A paper describes a structure:
Deoxyuridine 5′-triphosphate nucleotidohydrolase ([name]) is an enzyme encoded in nearly all prokaryotes, eukaryotes, and a majority of viruses. The enzyme catalyses the hydrolysis of [name] to dUMP, eventually controlling the cellular [name]:dTTP concentration to the level that could prevent incorporation of [name] into DNA, which would overwhelm the DNA repair system, leading to multiple DNA strand breaks and eventually, cell death. [name] [name] (NsdUTPase) plays a key role in the proliferation of Nocardia, and was regarded as a potent drug target. Among them, [name] was identified as the main cause of fish nocardiosis, which lead to severe economic losses in the aquaculture industry.
We expressed and purified NsdUTPase in E. coli, and resolved its first crystal structure with a resolution of 2.12 Å. Purified NsdUTPase was crystallised in 25% (w/v) polyethylene glycol-3350 and 0.1 M Tris–HCl pH 8.5. Resolved NsdUTPase crystal structure showed a classical trimer assembling, and each [name] monomer is an asymmetry unit folding into a jelly-roll β-barrel structure, composed of a total of 11 β-strands grouped into four antiparallel β-sheets in addition to a single short α-helix between the fourth and fifth β-sheets. The structure alignment showed that although NsdUTPase exhibited similar folding pattern with dUTPases from M. tuberculosis (MtdUTPase) and M. abscessus (MadUTPase), there were still some differences between their conformations. Trimeric NsdUTPase contained three identical ligand binding sites located at clefts between adjacent monomers. And dUMP bound in the cleft of two monomers interacts with two monomers. Then, we verified the detailed interactions between dUMP and NsdUTPase, the uracil group of dUMP formed hydrogen bonds with the main chain of Ile92 and Lys93 as well as the side chain of Asn79. The phosphate group of dUMP formed hydrogen bond with the side chain of Ser67. In addition, dUMP showed hydrophobic interactions with a series of surrounding residues, including Ile63, Ile92, Lys93, and Tyr88. The active site of NsdUTPase was located in the surface, and consists of a series of hydrophobic interactions, which might be a promising binding pocket for ligand binding.
Numbering used by the authors:
A (entry chain A), B (entry chain A), C (entry chain A): 4 to 143
The structure:
């Protein structure tokens, strides 16, 4: 698989690497210290820009450990990085703990980045849809 | 790629379109005005139904801008739209800001819809699993 | 498609099944009773371990009904289960309702598990990225 071009915007942030051979994501870091009070959110930079190939999408997922241990998550999760995006990747972090603030230092790992294929499809208006077993059963 | 049949249930909502050639998602709108007080959630309709082909899934992701700027997100994110679903697509919105209510008007864009392949696999019970390097290391 | 080896760690939890032929996910249950007070979170076990093949990822999504009806969600959503993981799958649940606690009993369905392909790519540092129409337009 062709590697993804990565631009290091911040010399103090390492190039992300895959920790185990089949791991879905690579770690993303914050380029700045932040204290996130309970219920508050903050947008931080990751120090990198990428050129994802057309046909793929980058997905920003919360880190599992910080989620369970501190309530740290991502407001717009899964964060959606489009193939044509050439800016710095940013993460919108939120503290879901009711009591304890979260302190993050520059260089701390804050999220993980997955790359997947996406169907670049068009939607064609029709007058009727075919029928299925599941039907209109759903709870939005 | 074969286009996806789309049924317009609401004549006041446009047919979604892909804004740039490789963008992962298309915009979804609310069919109704809502004011979402801090910490509250609401289920809104999008005015469309689709027939996704077997082998794919529709994913409802929060919009990036509204997430960072107002704290708007989706409670069940990523919202999972099954291939056999033939009802109106709905979005369960939540206001994660601690202070400021969010006002959305009919026609406002509230989320984005991605289409991806999904593995329709069966799970076979075994007595033992093979071993790996990562192991049982995880923080749920 | 080759079925996924599943290890039942808890004899009181059923083997997950796909409810309709094209449904994206299978149901995951909690192995324990929990009461989740408003704004609080809890890590529960699902009673199963799996061996996902290299090249895939397991994704833990909130259940749609409980999200809209009770505010139940997943803190690290989408929960990311790596191919090399051989431990018990766990779910970090959170109550986003401001008022009403959520009571879940052992055996209740709490989430859904999807399986998708993931691109196991490397990132190669470059000095410059190519240019696109979308550009650096984004709201993290
Ligand atoms: O954000 C969502 C999530 C689900 N659904 C619809 C389409 C799904 O296939 C159906 C699933 O609901 P349950 O069958 O899981 O209740 O609900 C939505 O409209 N929006
Ligand atoms: O919702 C989740 C997320 C992760 N994991 C497990 C499987 C993952 O591969 C492992 C990853 O945890 P870390 O290695 O990132 O700590 O934890 C879960 O059981 N449930
Ligand atoms: O978590 C996120 C989400 C989005 N983006 C960037 C890359 C996206 O393509 C662009 C999309 O933003 P809008 O064009 O949707 O405003 O923002 C991020 O850096 N981080």
């Amino acid at each position: 698989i062709p590697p993804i071009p990565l631009l290091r915007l911040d010399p103090g942030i390492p190039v992300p690497v895959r920790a185990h051979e089949g791991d879905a994501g690579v770690d993303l870091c914050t380029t700045e210290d932040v204290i996130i009070e309970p219920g508050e959110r903050v947008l931080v930079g990751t120090g990198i820009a990428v050129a994802l190939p057309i046909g793929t999408v980058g997905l920003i997922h919360p880190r599992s450990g910080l989620a369970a241990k501190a309530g740290l998550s991502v407001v717009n999760t899964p964060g959606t990085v489009d193939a044509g995006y050439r800016g710095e990747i940013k993460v919108c972090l939120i503290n879901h703990d009711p009591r304890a603030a979260i302190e993050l230092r520059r260089g701390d790992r804050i999220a993980q980045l997955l790359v997947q294929k996406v169907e670049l499809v068009d939607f064609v208006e029709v007058e009727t849809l075919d029928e299925t077993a599941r039907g209109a059963g759903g709870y939005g």
